[PDB]
Amino acid sequence: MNLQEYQSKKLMSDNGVRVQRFFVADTANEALEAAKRLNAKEIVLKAQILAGGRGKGVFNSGLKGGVHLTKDPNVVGQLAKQMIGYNLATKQTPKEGVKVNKVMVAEALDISRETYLAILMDRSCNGPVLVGSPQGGVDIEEVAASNPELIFKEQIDIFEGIKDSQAQRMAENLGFVGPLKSQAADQITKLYNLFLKIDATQVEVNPFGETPEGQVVCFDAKINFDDNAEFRQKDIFAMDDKSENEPIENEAAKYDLKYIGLDGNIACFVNGAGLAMATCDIIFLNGGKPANFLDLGGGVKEAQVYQAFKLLTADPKVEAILVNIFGGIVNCAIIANGITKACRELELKVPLVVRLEGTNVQEAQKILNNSGLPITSAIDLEDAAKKAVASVA
Amino acid sequence: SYTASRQHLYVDKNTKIICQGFTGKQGTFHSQQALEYGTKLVGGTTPGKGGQTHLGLPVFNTVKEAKEQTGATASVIYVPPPFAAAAINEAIEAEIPLVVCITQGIPQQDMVRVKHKLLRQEKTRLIGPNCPGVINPGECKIGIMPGHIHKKGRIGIVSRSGTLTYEAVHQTTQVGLGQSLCVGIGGDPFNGTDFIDCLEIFLNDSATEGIILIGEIGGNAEENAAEFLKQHNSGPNSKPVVSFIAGLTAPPGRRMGHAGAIIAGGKGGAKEKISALQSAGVVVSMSPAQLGTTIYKEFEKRKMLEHH
Ligand SMILES: CC(C)(COP(=O)(O)OP(=O)(O)OC[C@H]1O[C@@H](n2cnc3c(N)ncnc32)[C@H](O)[C@@H]1OP(=O)(O)O)[C@@H](O)C(=O)NCCC(=O)NCCS
Incomplete structure (x- = not known):
């Protein structure tokens, strides 16, 4: 799931993390009044979209740039008038851009020092870990490659909680000194408790830094959430902005199907994520370009097969479909009849290749061959992949 | 250390199994399937249904009681995600030698807490979850x-x-x-x-x-x-x-x-x-x-x- 800048910044602030003071406005007048209420010397206006590259984007109002600095609340309102309700296009958006319904009006803070600080569960140490670097404001992966001596880690015990000694040591390794070390340690502690409270998989602060006036601030952050915890994080998942997701992925999620679009033309779906990945792979190994990953989940349910076809028959780049169902006990003739039912009712127009394993496969293949539809059966996954690849120009 | 329990992975013809989440939809279906394969499923747990019967087998309120009455050496968990980590911990505390958790969707943070307990004992070997x-x-x-x-x-x-x-x-x-x-x-x-x-x-x-x-x-x-x-x-x-x-x-x-x-x-x-x-x-x-x-x-x- 995805949060707008103002949603993650509010979540942070509501949990004691120090961020720039800000308001959200959805009209130009609200932006002007918000700028007045900041009582700040320097103000930043930022359009709220999820895609990157706002700073160099263009609105279909003609206004250049999604981030503007000013001292004048009147200017904030005037520029917001040429943002709100317009589409903002960046290097990371489609050409139509993204409709901007909200802007953030925040105090513009100068940055004296930049560091990197993230909290995540360590898959090799089996607990939370703090990951920090004094080399802030840059891709942490680059820092790891170029300067691995500047990557610091503190393993935390889930039941002990974060200790002052751990927070202080990380703060020191990040380069904070004196009272700012104590501030940074306290902020690390608050970020750790936030990470646990919200079932984050990662809380990444970059830059985690200082202002010239001597405050430790989380200037920008990215939070990733554990989907498995949605049942106890309803308020946070209710904020999920799906407006910039691929539309078919949104439609898939409605039905508990995990769809991931790829850049290809041979669609596929499979019961089981490992085998779904493997089916994408084997299409590629045999000279094709998979169009998507689609895991139907456990249990071969006719409704899941039906919805899968509904998703794929929509995508204009799909030129063929490889269905791979390893159903064990389920009667493949029932699955076969469900497939022909879906292809008729949803008007399949592309070649379909079906690999069925389970019981009653012979009758299932007979059903598919007699359906009058462009359907071919496959004897194994390699045969299915070759047939799929050869079904397209 | 916990590695001492690796040998518990090698189930065999003497392994006796209890199903946690026995009376649920999937616990019932796969328990029915297990009995046809000749699996030595000997009972299961559902809190509050102890004393009942299910598929001709005893239902128990706790893993501890199920283990004492059946002699089970393994448990399989079909408990919903909100409670499945507690089910694993229950099996660990009862010192079930082998615990197999089928459940998909347990919060990662729950499992970090489960592993904390798991790694500090060695009577119970956990396979899973998901x-x-x-x-x-x-x-x-x-x-x-x-x-x-x-x-x-x-x-x-x-x-x-x-x-x-x-x-x-x-x-x-x-x-x-x-x-x-x-x-x-x-x-x-x-x-x-x-x-x-x-x-x-x-x-x-x-x-x-x-x-x-x-x-x-x-x-x-x-x-x-x-x-x-x-x-x-x-x-x-x-x-x-x-x-x-x-x-x-x-x-x-x-x-x-x-x-x-x-x-x-x-x-x-x-x-x-x-x-x-x-x-x-x-x-x-x-x-x-x-x-x-x-x-x-x-x-x-x-x-x-x-x-x-
Ligand atoms: C675990 C799972 C199967 C449960 O779904 P389900 O069987 O449809 O759920 P139900 O609600 O019918 O049954 C769960 C039962 O556990 C019981 N239960 C709850 N807490 C329990 C506990 N701590 N101990 C034992 N039983 C417990 C519930 O009371 C319920 O039984 P009841 O209805 O008789 O009271 C499901 O959540 C799941 O994870 N499915 C996917 C599994 C999967 O694909 N795994 C990966 C394989 S590779």
Whole structure:
């Protein structure tokens, strides 16, 4: 799931993390009044979209740039008038851009020092870990490659909680000194408790830094959430902005199907994520370009097969479909009849290749061959992949 | 330490099983299936239904009581995600030797807490969560895998996937080699058993003459297993290892179905896992359709077939 800048910044602030003071406005007048209420010397206006590259984007109002600095609340309102309700296009958006319904009006803070600080569960140490670097404001992966001596880690015990000694040591390794070390340690502690409270998989602060006036601030952050915890994080998942997701992925999620679009033309779906990945792979190994990953989940349910076809028959780049169902006990003739039912009712127009394993496969293949539809059966996954690849120009 | 419980993975004809979540929809269906396979399912738990009967077997309020009355040495968990970690902890506190958690969707943070307890004891061995279970073909099946495709034989299989494992099972049955023990360690990032745990069992089991390791993107368990094999599968009586790693075509930063299948911060890609394993002597099958033929050929090279 995805949060707008103002949603993650509010979540942070509501949990004691120090961020720039800000308001959200959805009209130009609200932006002007918000700028007045900041009582700040320097103000930043930022359009709220999820895609990157706002700073160099263009609105279909003609206004250049999604981030503007000013001292004048009147200017904030005037520029917001040429943002709100317009589409903002960046290097990371489609050409139509993204409709901007909200802007953030925040105090513009100068940055004296930049560091990197993230909290995540360590898959090799089996607990939370703090990951920090004094080399802030840059891709942490680059820092790891170029300067691995500047990557610091503190393993935390889930039941002990974060200790002052751990927070202080990380703060020191990040380069904070004196009272700012104590501030940074306290902020690390608050970020750790936030990470646990919200079932984050990662809380990444970059830059985690200082202002010239001597405050430790989380200037920008990215939070990733554990989907498995949605049942106890309803308020946070209710904020999920799906407006910039691929539309078919949104439609898939409605039905508990995990769809991931790829850049290809041979669609596929499979019961089981490992085998779904493997089916994408084997299409590629045999000279094709998979169009998507689609895991139907456990249990071969006719409704899941039906919805899968509904998703794929929509995508204009799909030129063929490889269905791979390893159903064990389920009667493949029932699955076969469900497939022909879906292809008729949803008007399949592309070649379909079906690999069925389970019981009653012979009758299932007979059903598919007699359906009058462009359907071919496959004897194994390699045969299915070759047939799929050869079904397209 | 917790590694002392690895031997509990090797279920057999004497393993007696209780089902946690016995009276639920999936606990009922797979318990019915287990009794047809001849599985020694002896009862199950549902809090508040102790004293009832289900599928002709006793229902219990606690794992402790179920264990005392049935003598069970293993439990299988079909408990919903909000409560499944508590179910695992209950089984651990009751010192069930083998616990197999099928449940998908347990919060990762719950499982970090579970592992904290798990790693500080050694009576209980956990397989899972988000896994299909374990099977000793013809002796004991714990979980949801289709028994009929297995055949007792000489390939040990360990896998992070469900149905992709059945592909490997089907292929090794078809080529006539069969399986000694198959362990689905599941698709979550925090779980009770990794590849090394199973490799240790396989390398020291005389019935296991070759190994298939099925992995995928995410984490570093495959790379850890490669290092283990460099150190412990190199002397005389080494065993052939074949592998397939799912996710060569996976994009970065996306959860590919399984909670643990994600390339993050540039780590977890399939290519690096394939190269690590190859450098440890593993024959990595690039195609998932050729696991059986690849391991068969390795048996042929070593003259491990009956016609030799
Ligand atoms: C675990 C799972 C199967 C449960 O779904 P379900 O069987 O449809 O759920 P139900 O609500 O019918 O049954 C769960 C039962 O557990 C019981 N239960 C709850 N807490 C319990 C506990 N601590 N101990 C024992 N039983 C418990 C519930 O009371 C319920 O039984 P009841 O209806 O008789 O009271 C499901 O959540 C799931 O994870 N499915 C996917 C599994 C999967 O694909 N795994 C990966 C394989 S590779």
